[PDB]
């Protein structure tokens, strides 16, 4: 970050700087970048978990333009407003992030079946949604949550929700927040540097889930990129106070 | 196929990214 104060050479008189209004209405200050990134962002709203797959994959990466919906493009399982959340807007300004992320997973159920959440460290790929690892046709005998990777379990009858913190298990110093084109086919090792691993959710029977993400406490962002080209058409969707 | 996969040859380098010689990208 370069403020540009270096280019402001005028030293003639100015009007007062006044007194800040921060804290006048309340002490709930909301300008800290880390504070903003620590409040949850909805990723998946009521998506399906199918036991015929290894599980539903969630790539470990913070919200940003990488998940932005564009009118006209193919329908994905990602909620459509991720790209306009304050935290995605902030992340679109920083290309580096290091630390843990926290996922709040809700299983829409009250059954006594355990649903497992398995953590996969950085392996090089970047996928999301239901997937049959190595394209097999049965996974209950070879469950990903029973292979040795760190796993946690949710039992809906006790609590249908859980909050898990995934570590920064990668070889790099920083994770790369975004690319100009999330679908470009370029050097494969670099392609996978935008995630630090995956979270895989596996059910016993078909059921739905919702997923939220936020920054952990041990988390930092950097490599400020400045603002991107933006657009807005808000004006058109509301009346002004003069009819 | 997917038009995002590869950048046209005249604007990119061997790494499938805009060439630093291609000034018109902006």
């Amino acid at each position: 970050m370069d403020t540009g104060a270096k280019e402001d050479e005028d030293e003639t008189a100015n009007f007062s700087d006044g007194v800040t209004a921060m804290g006048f209405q309340s002490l709930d200050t909301q300008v800290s970048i880390k504070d903003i990134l620590r409040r949850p962002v909805l990723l998946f709203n009521h998506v399906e978990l199918d036991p015929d797959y290894t599980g539903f994959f969630i790539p470990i990466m913070p919200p940003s333009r990488m998940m932005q919906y564009k009118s006209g493009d193919k329908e994905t399982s990602f909620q459509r407003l991720i790209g306009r959340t304050p935290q995605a807007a902030i992340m679109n300004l920083f290309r580096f992030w290091r630390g843990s992320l926290r996922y709040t997973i809700i299983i829409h159920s009250t059954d006594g079946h355990p649903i497992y959440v398995t953590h996969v460290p950085h392996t090089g790929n970047r996928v999301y949604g239901l997937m049959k690892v190595n394209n097999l046709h049965e996974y209950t005998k070879v469950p990903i949550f029973g292979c040795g990777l760190t796993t946690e379990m949710i039992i809906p009858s006790v609590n249908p929700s859980i909050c898990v913190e995934v570590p920064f298990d990668t070889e790099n110093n920083w994770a790369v927040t975004f690319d100009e084109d999330a679908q470009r086919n370029y050097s494969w090792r670099d392609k996978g540097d935008t995630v630090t691993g995956h979270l895989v959710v596996t059910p016993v029977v078909s059921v739905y889930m919702s997923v939220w993400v936020e920054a952990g406490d041990d988390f930092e962002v950097s490599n400020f990129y400045g603002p991107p080209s933006v657009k807005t058409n808000d004006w058109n969707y509301a009346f002004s106070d003069e009819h | 196929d997917n038009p995002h996969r590869f950048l046209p040859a005249n604007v990119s380098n061997r790494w499938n990214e805009y060439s630093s010689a291609y000034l018109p990208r902006v």
């Binding site: 970050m1 800040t20 620590r38 932005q68 959340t85 970047r126 570590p167 509301a238 | -």
Partner: protein
């Protein structure tokens, strides 16, 4: 022995701990061998020059607008005239372009306050000469042809010459301690839906449009020597004052308009050519 334990407490069950908060406590369970181990920032950490708050970002000078000033512009003429609302650049048309850092960050809040700073950079040389007057006008505005109405407000007259730049702090003078953003707090429209009044009547709010304006008028007609350009461009930079404040996180009013492609699964989704 197996004595009975009579200790008890009444409890109120809740599904999550600190779900809405950005600070406080979290009941997150670590996917680690050690439940309390954390990422190390001993060697790799955020650089000290990176912004830490949205106010830091709002303090970065951004190019807001530009306007021309020529030797043909008569005295009193408005060279620049705009409603100074960090919430929306236009109230009657879409915006697309490189919004300033302070407007970008203000677009994440429902309220803003404090003085706003402007910097006018005249892209000229030592042979251009003239004088303009910058004015901050509140509540009621001036006629485009009545320079005196602008001169009756908060003004700074700049004598263009050897120095080609002038700073201007726009006072914050309103009937409320903070001002509410004119953009929306929530807009579910994603497919450019052709709007009608029913849609507007059912919006998240009512736009409280600002009447506060900043104008730049010709005081002494620009008189460059014949050997140089007779018209110059003036760059208008803007940023939050040192006491600029923001509050009320909401849906971002601005969103990326260039090179937006959502991720797909790599390499499953046909990356294998």
């Amino acid at each position: 022995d197996k004595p009975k334990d009579v200790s008890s407490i009444t409890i109120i069950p809740k599904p999550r701990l600190g779900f809405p908060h950005g600070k406080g406590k979290s009941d997150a369970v670590a996917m680690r061998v050690n439940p309390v181990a954390l990422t190390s920032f001993q060697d790799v950490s955020a650089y000290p020059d990176e912004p830490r708050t949205t106010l830091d970002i709002a303090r970065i000078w951004g190019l807001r607008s530009t306007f021309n000033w020529g030797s043909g512009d008569e005295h009193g003429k408005e060279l620049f005239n705009t409603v100074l609302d960090p919430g929306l650049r236009f109230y009657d048309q879409d915006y697309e372009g490189q919004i300033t850092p302070m407007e970008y960050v203000t677009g994440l809040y429902n309220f803003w306050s404090g003085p706003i700073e402007l910097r006018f950079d005249f892209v000229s040389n030592a042979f251009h000469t003239g004088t303009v007057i910058i004015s901050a006008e509140y509540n009621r505005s001036s006629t485009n042809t009545d320079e005196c109405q602008s001169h009756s407000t908060y003004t700074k007259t700049f004598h263009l010459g050897e120095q080609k730049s002038v700073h201007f702090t726009v006072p914050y003078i309103y009937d409320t301690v903070v001002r509410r953003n004119t953009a929306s707090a929530y807009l579910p429209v994603t497919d450019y839906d052709k709007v009608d009044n029913v849609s507007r009547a059912q919006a998240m709010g009512i736009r409280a449009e600002s009447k506060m304006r900043v104008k730049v008028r010709v005081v002494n007609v620009l008189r460059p020597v014949a050997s140089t350009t007779s018209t110059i461009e003036v760059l208008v930079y803007m940023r939050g004052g040192k006491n600029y404040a923001l509050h009320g996180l909401k849906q971002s009013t601005y969103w990326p308009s260039n090179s937006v492609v959502p991720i797909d699964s790599f390499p499953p989704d046909g990356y294998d050519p």
